[PDB]
Amino acid sequence: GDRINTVRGPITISEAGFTLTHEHICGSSAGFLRAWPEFFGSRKALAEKAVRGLRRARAAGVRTIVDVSTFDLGRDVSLLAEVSRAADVHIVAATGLWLDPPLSMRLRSVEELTQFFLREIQYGIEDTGIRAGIIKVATTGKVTPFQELVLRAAARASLATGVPVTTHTAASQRGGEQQAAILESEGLSPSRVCIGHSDATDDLSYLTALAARGYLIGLDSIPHSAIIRSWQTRALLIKALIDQGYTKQILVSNDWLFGISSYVTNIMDVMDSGNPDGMAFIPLRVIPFLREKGIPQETLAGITVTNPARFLSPTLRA
Amino acid sequence: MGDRINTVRGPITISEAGFTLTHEHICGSSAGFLRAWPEFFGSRKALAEKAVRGLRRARAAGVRTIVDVSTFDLGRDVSLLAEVSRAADVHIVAATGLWLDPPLSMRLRSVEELTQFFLREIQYGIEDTGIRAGIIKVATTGKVTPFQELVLRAAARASLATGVPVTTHTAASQRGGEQQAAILESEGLSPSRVCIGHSDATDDLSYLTALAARGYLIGLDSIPHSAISASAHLGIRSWQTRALLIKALIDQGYTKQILVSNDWLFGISSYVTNIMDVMDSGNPDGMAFIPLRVIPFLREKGIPQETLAGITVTNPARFLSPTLRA
Ligand SMILES: CCCCCCP(=O)(O)Oc1ccc2ccccc2c1
Ligand SMILES: CCCCCCP(=O)(O)Oc1ccc2ccccc2c1
Ligand SMILES: [Zn+2]
Ligand SMILES: [Zn+2]
Ligand SMILES: [Zn+2]
């Protein structure tokens, strides 16, 4: 133990089950949900939609999701705890920073950012006692100077705790290469890192090189195509990496959410009509699509159960 | 409305406000930051206790009310305001609006949506506290951005629907007040509902008097910032220079347009670490700087006691009093 922190407390890795490693309850901004809950109809309406959505995902086999909403994505761990309890789905909460850090974060040193990430992992988030079980970082283009500080702080928090790092990248710009250079310079093992949004390219050699270095490859936005590139085209990247022998490097998810304020108004209605399966898109469409392309059950179980368990269990490090 | 002002302890009558500092902060931060990382300030309790000591000392020096012009995106925590207002027994008026650091969920909103957010905070309450804003704070860069113009129009519509005043953050060295006033007036807002803030950062009396002559309130609100080289041997600019702008505006006949404040804080995270120690070293009086140093300096220049009382009492009362909506 080696246990994984969830918003309801620690769980053993055998409890994690079928895990979606990149999801959101709500994509927002710090403070926003509590200051303007009517933007989502109400806090109650958002909670009830998320409960129904997680209960839908649970009925399709999901047992754990990783909500990679950070501070600056408006993460509200008390909402996560509520919907987790009512849906009987484990939710792992995140620390780190995404692409919208306020001034009080932008002006911090790497040492200070490290103590904030560590506080959220070791002590708890806000006054809730809920501890993060993953560190989420986002970078753009070439890593900005501040984004490099965040990566180094993330590496340092991970190295003290064994909790893994998952990233937001622009795959069309091959952004994981710069992320990997920085994280390795800190001494972080690639086996502690998921390079996410990696399904947003056709450049397989970029993904294969990262997997061959030990990185987990986050093919985590497949339903976003379903809203030229078909979602089945993105799904075939999973088979491509399987076929090259890197199934133990693959993590798959929807990158879905149940409310969104960090974008144009009503985008949630467009997203939901584009993907009515929500977070069940992965188990209900991608998994059977991979099966009829000849992927065996043992491999799919490895990807959806074994890999997330290894990824999320704190190590220390191989 | 009429003769009642919303505070973090609930409504009070005009007469209760007394000596009022119209531009102050308990904590200069970011949305969510204080609750997510209180040990940045030592602890929430350590920050509350520092604010309470500070407000008590300002109260001993005569202060009865501060206006905390911290917006959502300056990390306003009205629960913290209410706690320290009650412990110090000093009225605190809370703000809505948006400052210079709106997150994505604010940056992508329409004017109609921002108008609703501001109305929510004035008419219903901030977050789930029931505490209603008594002022609308807006900030612009020198030249107003498209989003900042949206914020100004929403602030005007909220002010016109509720009667609560608007107070602004400007770059005085770029005459920021003039672009703001033009946008506000294009929405039909009276200049008498608007304070143009940080106006003591300039020595351009022509800029200050023209705004005053249109009925704007002039926020000479950061006097002690001057109290703490460069390559060109530039020097600082003393706090007495800033304070003499008060006398200048009195001598031009615009006594009734002057608001005076410290723009102080008891914690700050929206700046490089350790700026708070530097500020407290430079101005140990905190928010008491106005009553303990500025008032006697102006008295010493022949300004009558009753003129100083009108500036620090009557002008804020007239400005804060909700004005115009049946
Ligand atoms: C800016 C959208 C708020 C949620 C961002 C979370 P993400 O970095 O994982 O990826 C997303 C997630 C949802 C999106 C919806 C519309 C457009 C782009 C989107 C990108
Ligand atoms: C920029 C972080 C300070 C919070 C904003 C307060 P303000 O914009 O109303 O005026 C001040 C108030 C205090 C300040 C202290 C150091 C640097 C800048 C300052 C600006
Ligand atoms: Zn992302
Ligand atoms: Zn995401
Ligand atoms: Zn300001």
XYZ file of C-alpha atoms and ligand atoms in Angstrom:
687
model
C 0.000 0.000 0.000
C 0.873 1.454 -2.546
C -2.756 2.525 -2.064
C -4.310 5.171 -4.332
C -5.869 8.308 -2.850
C -9.434 9.014 -4.010
C -11.916 11.694 -3.047
C -13.489 9.156 -0.669
C -10.198 8.000 0.849
C -7.497 5.480 -0.027
C -8.235 2.368 -2.073
C -6.139 -0.676 -2.898
C -4.986 -0.997 -6.488
C -7.256 -4.041 -6.929
C -10.267 -1.778 -6.205
C -9.443 0.633 -9.048
C -10.752 -1.695 -11.723
C -11.528 -0.370 -15.199
C -10.077 3.167 -14.933
C -10.468 6.207 -17.213
C -7.256 8.146 -16.650
C -8.184 11.567 -18.150
C -11.665 12.917 -17.395
C -13.361 15.934 -15.814
C -16.469 16.446 -13.765
C -16.469 20.128 -14.666
C -14.128 22.198 -16.781
C -14.158 25.603 -15.115
C -11.987 28.211 -13.384
C -10.832 28.577 -9.790
C -13.572 29.974 -7.597
C -16.051 30.018 -10.491
C -18.398 27.161 -9.526
C -18.973 28.626 -6.074
C -19.344 32.210 -7.348
C -21.675 31.590 -10.286
C -23.314 28.140 -10.030
C -26.315 29.396 -12.030
C -24.001 29.436 -15.030
C -24.532 25.642 -14.879
C -28.239 25.987 -14.141
C -27.407 25.232 -10.515
C -24.807 23.345 -8.520
C -27.530 20.745 -7.919
C -28.216 20.355 -11.652
C -24.521 19.922 -12.420
C -24.097 17.352 -9.638
C -27.123 15.356 -10.771
C -26.009 15.299 -14.421
C -22.554 14.114 -13.357
C -24.073 11.451 -11.093
C -26.169 10.121 -13.996
C -23.134 10.280 -16.288
C -20.880 8.401 -13.888
C -23.614 5.845 -13.164
C -23.902 5.388 -16.929
C -20.135 4.849 -17.155
C -20.212 2.457 -14.178
C -22.919 0.387 -15.889
C -20.574 0.166 -18.904
C -17.815 -1.254 -16.684
C -15.962 1.838 -15.422
C -14.966 1.672 -11.766
C -12.557 4.637 -11.399
C -12.067 7.899 -13.258
C -9.175 10.304 -12.870
C -10.464 13.879 -12.789
C -7.444 15.784 -14.058
C -9.031 19.155 -13.266
C -6.445 21.320 -11.555
C -6.815 24.374 -9.317
C -7.043 26.668 -12.341
C -9.584 24.430 -14.086
C -11.906 25.171 -11.175
C -11.593 21.742 -9.545
C -14.066 21.499 -6.648
C -13.126 18.345 -4.747
C -16.252 18.615 -2.599
C -18.377 18.237 -5.734
C -16.167 15.309 -6.820
C -16.689 13.678 -3.435
C -20.471 14.132 -3.659
C -20.893 12.678 -7.149
C -18.409 9.901 -6.386
C -20.419 8.766 -3.356
C -23.774 8.948 -5.160
C -22.494 7.180 -8.301
C -20.337 4.590 -6.479
C -17.459 5.399 -8.849
C -13.971 6.113 -7.535
C -12.636 9.544 -8.451
C -8.935 10.339 -8.221
C -8.325 14.101 -7.803
C -5.452 16.076 -9.335
C -3.006 18.755 -8.334
C -0.790 20.641 -10.805
C -1.672 23.523 -13.117
C -3.379 23.803 -16.480
C -3.247 26.645 -19.041
C -5.077 29.342 -17.010
C -2.979 29.997 -13.858
C -3.961 33.243 -12.137
C -1.353 35.840 -11.137
C -1.005 34.337 -7.667
C 0.280 31.171 -9.373
C 2.120 32.772 -12.325
C 4.435 34.725 -10.021
C 5.501 31.767 -7.887
C 8.947 30.212 -7.941
C 9.529 26.537 -8.697
C 10.194 25.985 -4.992
C 6.845 27.548 -4.086
C 4.894 25.651 -6.754
C 6.496 22.452 -5.440
C 5.196 23.092 -1.928
C 1.684 23.748 -3.295
C 1.611 20.507 -5.283
C 3.043 18.648 -2.276
C 0.448 20.162 0.034
C -2.365 18.918 -2.192
C -0.867 15.384 -2.318
C 0.388 14.994 1.258
C -1.932 17.183 3.381
C -5.117 17.689 1.370
C -6.955 19.981 -1.014
C -8.340 23.155 0.585
C -9.753 22.208 4.027
C -11.329 18.916 2.867
C -8.607 16.416 3.760
C -8.936 14.948 0.239
C -5.508 14.233 -1.219
C -4.596 14.332 -4.910
C -3.408 11.105 -6.490
C -2.046 12.591 -9.742
C -0.199 15.736 -10.892
C -1.534 17.380 -14.050
C 0.551 19.756 -16.196
C -0.293 21.519 -19.458
C 2.132 23.114 -21.913
C 1.762 24.955 -25.217
C 3.997 25.116 -28.276
C 7.507 25.251 -27.037
C 7.214 25.129 -23.238
C 6.942 28.673 -21.873
C 9.298 29.667 -19.028
C 6.484 29.451 -16.503
C 5.325 26.099 -17.898
C 8.857 24.778 -17.379
C 8.668 25.781 -13.705
C 5.398 23.845 -13.446
C 6.932 20.745 -15.030
C 9.933 20.856 -12.700
C 7.669 21.393 -9.680
C 5.539 18.477 -10.877
C 8.605 16.258 -11.192
C 9.776 17.262 -7.719
C 6.359 16.572 -6.169
C 6.205 13.194 -7.941
C 9.708 12.243 -6.819
C 8.896 12.913 -3.153
C 5.549 11.066 -3.271
C 5.568 8.517 -6.119
C 2.337 10.009 -7.497
C 2.418 10.139 -11.340
C 2.425 13.078 -13.757
C 0.023 13.423 -16.670
C 0.290 16.129 -19.290
C -1.728 18.228 -21.685
C 0.189 18.665 -24.894
C -0.309 19.813 -28.474
C 0.396 16.578 -30.366
C 0.403 18.429 -33.710
C 3.452 20.281 -32.335
C 4.977 17.057 -30.898
C 4.920 18.800 -27.510
C 5.733 15.694 -25.464
C 9.345 15.809 -26.641
C 10.037 19.043 -24.762
C 8.008 17.869 -21.765
C 10.056 14.661 -21.649
C 13.375 16.510 -21.878
C 12.502 18.721 -18.904
C 11.016 15.969 -16.729
C 14.000 13.670 -17.339
C 16.438 16.486 -16.479
C 14.733 16.484 -13.079
C 15.387 12.758 -12.707
C 11.777 11.662 -13.133
C 11.332 8.214 -14.614
C 9.219 8.133 -17.824
C 7.207 5.295 -16.288
C 5.766 7.952 -13.929
C 4.574 10.155 -16.846
C 1.584 10.073 -19.201
C 1.974 12.241 -22.323
C -1.699 13.118 -22.900
C -3.803 14.266 -25.880
C -1.487 12.046 -27.903
C -4.419 10.876 -30.008
C -4.533 14.303 -31.725
C -1.948 13.358 -34.369
C -1.356 10.880 -37.170
C 2.406 10.923 -36.505
C 2.910 7.408 -35.150
C 6.723 7.604 -35.055
C 6.438 10.389 -32.457
C 4.232 8.209 -30.238
C 6.345 5.081 -30.752
C 9.558 6.900 -29.802
C 7.948 8.167 -26.582
C 6.551 4.743 -25.682
C 9.936 3.140 -26.390
C 11.452 5.528 -23.817
C 8.993 4.310 -21.165
C 6.365 7.076 -21.334
C 2.702 6.207 -21.019
C 0.875 7.380 -24.138
C -2.410 9.117 -23.356
C -4.839 8.388 -26.190
C -7.419 10.214 -24.196
C -9.604 12.442 -26.423
C -11.066 9.941 -28.905
C -14.712 11.175 -28.706
C -13.527 14.695 -29.525
C -13.148 13.547 -33.150
C -16.803 12.398 -33.149
C -17.950 16.011 -32.718
C -11.860 14.825 -41.479
C -10.509 12.649 -38.663
C -12.982 9.973 -37.597
C -12.917 8.670 -34.063
C -12.152 5.263 -35.581
C -8.983 6.773 -37.081
C -7.886 7.900 -33.609
C -8.865 4.514 -32.180
C -6.562 2.774 -34.687
C -3.592 4.463 -33.012
C -4.322 2.173 -30.057
C -4.051 -0.861 -32.337
C -0.960 0.620 -33.987
C 0.833 0.824 -30.628
C -0.425 -2.614 -29.581
C 0.859 -4.000 -32.886
C 4.298 -2.487 -32.232
C 4.445 -4.125 -28.806
C 3.719 -1.159 -26.529
C 0.315 -2.108 -25.021
C 1.734 -1.651 -21.528
C 2.326 2.020 -22.453
C -1.245 2.816 -23.537
C -3.815 4.704 -21.480
C -7.197 5.518 -23.030
C -9.941 7.913 -21.930
C -12.644 10.285 -23.244
C -11.529 13.646 -21.807
C -15.215 14.253 -21.213
C -17.002 16.565 -18.779
C -20.492 17.307 -17.492
C -20.228 21.094 -17.365
C -17.895 23.569 -18.989
C -17.456 27.281 -18.362
C -13.901 27.785 -19.683
C -15.220 28.048 -23.241
C -18.060 29.615 -25.213
C -21.557 29.393 -23.784
C -23.581 26.283 -24.773
C -20.598 24.272 -26.056
C -21.810 21.594 -23.639
C -24.954 21.027 -25.727
C -22.859 20.691 -28.881
C -20.494 18.211 -27.204
C -23.298 16.118 -25.699
C -25.212 15.789 -28.969
C -21.951 14.893 -30.710
C -21.207 12.203 -28.087
C -24.362 11.120 -26.224
C -22.417 8.208 -24.670
C -20.284 10.672 -22.667
C -17.670 8.893 -20.570
C -19.126 5.540 -21.712
C -17.797 6.247 -25.206
C -14.545 4.364 -24.482
C -16.153 1.165 -23.085
C -19.171 1.219 -25.406
C -17.628 2.193 -28.753
C -13.822 2.082 -28.735
C -13.505 -1.254 -26.885
C -15.882 -3.140 -29.254
C -14.252 -1.444 -32.258
C -10.865 -2.733 -31.117
C -12.367 -6.211 -30.616
C -13.655 -6.442 -34.170
C -10.220 -5.389 -35.370
C -8.980 -8.537 -33.598
C -7.685 -7.149 -30.284
C -8.033 -9.910 -27.657
C -9.793 -9.423 -24.334
C -6.583 -9.975 -22.354
C -4.950 -7.016 -24.129
C -7.972 -4.734 -23.648
C -8.105 -5.669 -19.956
C -4.395 -4.905 -19.713
C -4.974 -1.445 -21.180
C -8.045 -0.461 -19.171
C -7.266 -2.164 -15.814
C -3.600 -3.160 -15.532
C -1.925 -0.077 -17.002
C -3.910 2.493 -14.956
C -3.258 0.473 -11.797
C 0.502 0.418 -12.424
C 0.432 4.086 -13.439
C -1.506 5.333 -10.397
C 0.053 3.187 -7.651
C 2.785 5.343 -6.031
C 6.377 4.341 -6.949
C 9.579 4.692 -6.592
C 9.850 3.855 -9.739
C 10.203 1.493 -12.743
C -31.584 51.496 -1.088
C -32.245 55.143 -0.297
C -30.161 55.539 2.858
C -28.852 51.979 3.304
C -25.533 50.459 2.200
C -24.710 46.747 1.964
C -21.800 45.587 4.133
C -20.370 42.169 4.891
C -22.314 42.324 8.170
C -25.544 43.301 6.411
C -27.237 46.625 5.695
C -26.294 49.798 7.577
C -27.558 53.368 7.414
C -25.550 56.157 5.760
C -24.921 57.829 9.118
C -23.178 54.718 10.475
C -20.416 54.675 7.827
C -18.419 57.550 9.386
C -14.762 57.974 8.369
C -14.473 55.768 5.275
C -11.419 54.561 3.357
C -12.904 53.994 -0.103
C -10.170 51.820 -1.686
C -8.569 49.124 0.485
C -7.987 45.361 0.475
C -7.932 42.730 3.176
C -5.949 40.462 0.854
C -4.716 40.950 -2.704
C -4.921 37.491 -4.233
C -6.622 35.344 -6.927
C -9.936 33.479 -7.093
C -9.778 30.297 -5.019
C -6.174 30.955 -3.951
C -6.687 31.750 -0.277
C -8.736 28.591 0.320
C -6.417 26.368 -1.725
C -3.113 27.604 -0.286
C -3.644 29.473 3.006
C -0.148 28.698 4.250
C 1.131 31.054 1.549
C -0.006 33.676 4.100
C 1.309 31.643 7.033
C -2.250 30.513 7.692
C -5.799 31.749 7.207
C -5.887 32.490 10.957
C -2.563 34.336 10.827
C -3.916 36.466 7.959
C -7.214 37.111 9.730
C -5.383 38.080 12.941
C -3.088 40.472 11.081
C -6.068 42.119 9.367
C -7.861 42.429 12.703
C -4.866 44.057 14.405
C -4.524 46.399 11.439
C -8.195 47.329 11.292
C -8.337 47.836 15.060
C -5.427 50.285 14.841
C -7.062 52.121 11.937
C -10.242 52.174 14.057
C -8.387 53.688 17.004
C -7.151 56.344 14.558
C -10.753 57.195 13.607
C -11.633 54.831 10.730
C -15.152 53.393 10.856
C -15.560 51.817 7.385
C -13.367 50.496 4.601
C -14.464 49.605 1.089
C -12.712 46.381 0.086
C -12.490 46.707 -3.693
C -11.302 43.134 -4.213
C -13.168 41.476 -7.073
C -13.690 37.787 -7.786
C -10.392 37.705 -9.672
C -8.465 39.500 -6.925
C -9.347 36.540 -4.713
C -12.001 38.297 -2.631
C -13.083 35.933 0.158
C -16.113 37.647 1.689
C -16.187 35.078 4.504
C -12.755 36.381 5.456
C -14.028 39.970 5.134
C -16.994 39.262 7.424
C -14.829 37.527 10.048
C -12.342 40.394 10.266
C -15.031 43.110 10.004
C -16.785 41.593 13.020
C -13.610 41.032 15.036
C -12.367 44.585 14.344
C -15.856 46.163 14.533
C -15.157 48.087 11.321
C -17.708 48.191 8.516
C -16.449 46.589 5.309
C -18.187 47.107 1.972
C -17.574 44.298 -0.522
C -17.156 44.630 -4.277
C -18.270 42.862 -7.406
C -16.865 43.558 -10.888
C -13.655 42.282 -12.455
C -10.058 43.390 -12.052
C -7.072 42.726 -14.376
C -6.864 38.917 -13.981
C -10.167 37.417 -15.173
C -9.949 33.653 -15.675
C -11.094 31.990 -18.863
C -14.582 31.422 -17.462
C -14.940 35.220 -17.153
C -12.941 36.207 -20.284
C -15.340 34.301 -22.562
C -18.573 35.826 -21.225
C -20.806 38.249 -23.093
C -21.848 41.656 -21.803
C -25.291 40.243 -20.956
C -23.698 37.414 -18.956
C -21.293 39.667 -17.054
C -24.219 41.987 -16.287
C -26.039 39.013 -14.735
C -22.990 37.990 -12.680
C -22.638 41.506 -11.261
C -26.374 41.704 -10.537
C -26.191 38.347 -8.802
C -23.552 39.668 -6.435
C -25.380 42.946 -5.737
C -28.973 41.712 -5.519
C -28.749 38.113 -4.231
C -25.357 37.582 -2.638
C -21.757 36.605 -3.201
C -21.236 32.809 -3.448
C -23.477 31.167 -0.815
C -22.898 33.781 1.894
C -25.854 36.108 1.389
C -23.381 39.004 1.561
C -24.252 41.584 -1.080
C -21.778 43.799 -2.896
C -22.084 47.544 -2.289
C -19.803 48.706 -5.130
C -18.729 47.572 -8.610
C -14.978 47.532 -9.265
C -13.597 47.697 -12.833
C -9.989 47.822 -14.043
C -8.522 48.734 -17.400
C -5.108 48.934 -18.879
C -4.162 52.338 -20.272
C -5.965 51.644 -23.529
C -9.166 49.699 -22.846
C -9.210 46.178 -24.284
C -12.304 44.685 -25.954
C -12.979 42.536 -22.898
C -12.438 45.440 -20.491
C -14.973 47.499 -22.449
C -17.454 44.633 -22.010
C -16.723 44.769 -18.262
C -17.301 48.553 -18.159
C -20.635 48.293 -20.002
C -21.835 45.491 -17.727
C -20.778 47.504 -14.678
C -22.761 50.484 -15.994
C -25.899 48.416 -16.608
C -25.608 46.865 -13.142
C -25.120 50.311 -11.600
C -28.142 51.661 -13.492
C -30.309 48.734 -12.343
C -29.257 48.850 -8.667
C -27.922 52.330 -7.879
C -24.601 51.008 -6.534
C -21.502 52.962 -7.640
C -18.598 52.028 -9.898
C -14.980 52.436 -8.900
C -12.109 51.999 -11.331
C -8.457 51.028 -11.464
C -6.516 53.157 -13.964
C -3.032 53.999 -15.162
C -3.117 57.723 -14.362
C 0.129 58.265 -16.306
C -1.890 57.312 -19.410
C -5.013 59.309 -18.424
C -6.918 56.014 -18.279
C -9.889 57.761 -16.677
C -10.889 59.435 -19.942
C -11.404 56.226 -21.952
C -13.338 54.693 -19.051
C -15.572 57.741 -18.632
C -16.448 57.796 -22.335
C -17.525 54.144 -22.309
C -19.451 54.504 -19.049
C -21.257 57.627 -20.297
C -22.149 55.875 -23.573
C -24.239 53.501 -21.416
C -26.064 56.415 -19.738
C -24.246 56.223 -16.390
C -23.932 59.429 -14.392
C -20.363 60.498 -13.510
C -21.574 60.977 -9.908
C -21.818 57.157 -9.628
C -18.176 56.683 -10.694
C -14.843 57.027 -8.909
C -11.741 57.164 -11.128
C -9.149 55.361 -8.981
C -5.365 55.598 -8.568
C -5.598 59.205 -9.670
C -2.859 60.226 -7.224
C -0.305 58.447 -9.454
C -0.116 61.530 -11.694
C 0.782 65.202 -11.270
C -1.435 66.187 -14.231
C -3.849 68.532 -12.505
C -5.560 69.308 -15.828
C -6.520 65.642 -16.139
C -7.766 65.547 -12.535
C -9.777 68.779 -12.595
C -11.517 68.085 -15.918
C -12.811 64.757 -14.593
C -13.863 66.424 -11.350
C -15.662 69.149 -13.311
C -17.776 66.485 -15.044
C -18.830 65.186 -11.630
C -16.541 62.158 -11.393
C -15.192 61.181 -8.005
C -11.394 61.383 -7.933
C -9.695 58.522 -6.117
C -6.535 59.795 -4.460
C -6.339 56.336 -3.043
C -2.740 55.106 -2.847
C -0.968 57.890 -0.909
C 1.449 55.679 1.104
C 2.611 53.619 -1.905
C 5.151 56.405 -2.441
C 6.504 55.602 1.042
C 8.186 52.408 -0.414
C 17.092 55.380 -7.966
C 16.786 53.662 -11.368
C 19.515 54.142 -13.997
C 18.522 57.677 -15.036
C 18.790 58.886 -11.391
C 15.006 59.306 -11.421
C 14.189 59.245 -7.706
C 10.904 58.227 -6.121
C 8.115 60.852 -5.708
C 7.189 61.506 -2.079
C 3.898 60.843 -0.317
C 3.492 64.537 0.512
C 3.502 65.272 -3.221
C 0.582 62.859 -3.586
C -1.178 64.365 -0.569
C -0.877 67.900 -1.981
C -3.150 66.833 -4.860
C -5.922 66.840 -2.265
C -5.169 70.482 -1.469
C -4.848 71.294 -5.184
C -8.326 69.932 -5.914
C -9.773 71.710 -2.874
C -8.276 75.009 -4.082
C -9.907 74.567 -7.513
C -13.325 74.221 -5.830
C -13.696 70.431 -6.203
C -13.730 69.469 -2.504
C -16.852 67.390 -3.045
C -15.194 65.222 -5.720
C -12.261 63.897 -3.637
C -12.024 60.398 -2.171
C -8.937 59.482 -0.145
C -7.523 56.053 0.712
C -4.392 53.934 1.273
C -4.984 51.007 -1.107
C -3.319 48.929 1.574
C -3.548 45.176 2.202
C -2.755 42.655 4.943
C -1.679 39.894 2.565
C -0.767 39.747 -1.104
C -0.215 36.775 -3.402
C -0.768 38.504 -6.756
C 2.806 39.831 -6.674
C 6.292 38.460 -6.154
C 6.843 36.867 -2.758
C 7.936 39.168 0.111
C 6.399 42.412 -1.206
C 4.247 42.486 1.943
C 7.278 42.697 4.269
C 8.636 45.544 2.137
C 5.321 47.404 2.235
C 4.870 46.979 5.994
C 8.460 48.121 6.546
C 7.804 51.205 4.432
C 4.400 52.080 5.928
C 4.093 50.590 9.436
C 0.816 52.521 9.884
C -1.021 50.390 7.317
C -4.508 51.744 6.723
C -3.963 54.224 9.568
C -1.620 56.203 7.292
C -4.491 58.430 6.117
C -5.695 59.487 9.608
C -2.276 59.597 11.289
C -0.111 61.227 8.643
C -2.179 62.655 5.783
C -4.900 64.442 7.772
C -2.440 66.313 10.057
C -0.306 67.245 7.044
C -3.350 68.775 5.318
C -4.482 70.531 8.505
C -0.959 71.956 8.770
C -1.463 73.440 5.276
C -4.483 75.437 6.446
C -7.196 73.094 5.195
C -10.123 73.365 7.644
C -11.170 70.445 9.798
C -14.645 70.562 8.294
C -13.263 70.240 4.765
C -11.311 67.142 5.785
C -14.438 65.730 7.427
C -16.483 66.328 4.285
C -13.855 64.514 2.210
C -13.469 61.507 4.529
C -17.119 61.227 5.664
C -19.667 63.060 3.511
C -18.123 62.346 0.093
C -17.936 58.531 0.665
C -21.458 58.556 2.110
C -22.795 60.368 -0.968
C -20.853 58.057 -3.297
C -21.749 54.741 -1.635
C -25.394 55.607 -1.012
C -27.371 53.754 -3.714
C -28.668 56.468 -5.990
C -31.392 56.324 -8.653
C -33.961 53.528 -9.153
C -37.473 54.338 -7.754
C -10.960 25.075 -22.770
C -11.963 23.937 -22.581
C -12.139 23.636 -21.090
C -11.800 22.174 -20.794
C -10.339 21.943 -21.176
C -9.901 20.586 -20.645
P -8.696 19.819 -21.848
O -7.386 20.582 -21.909
O -8.392 18.425 -21.371
O -9.244 19.566 -23.392
C -10.409 20.084 -23.966
C -11.618 19.670 -23.402
C -12.817 20.137 -23.928
C -12.813 21.001 -25.043
C -14.022 21.472 -25.589
C -14.004 22.323 -26.685
C -12.793 22.708 -27.249
C -11.601 22.246 -26.715
C -11.619 21.386 -25.603
C -10.405 20.922 -25.069
C -0.916 43.842 -8.304
C -1.184 43.109 -6.989
C -1.777 44.065 -5.953
C -3.280 43.822 -5.870
C -3.978 44.903 -6.691
C -4.263 46.051 -5.733
P -4.410 47.642 -6.691
O -4.295 47.375 -8.175
O -5.763 48.217 -6.386
O -3.252 48.737 -6.215
C -2.033 48.211 -5.750
C -1.940 48.030 -4.367
C -0.782 47.519 -3.800
C 0.312 47.180 -4.616
C 1.494 46.664 -4.046
C 2.572 46.329 -4.859
C 2.481 46.506 -6.236
C 1.315 47.015 -6.797
C 0.224 47.356 -5.977
C -0.953 47.870 -6.555
Zn -5.963 19.088 -21.885
Zn -8.711 17.292 -19.954
Zn -5.976 49.016 -8.519
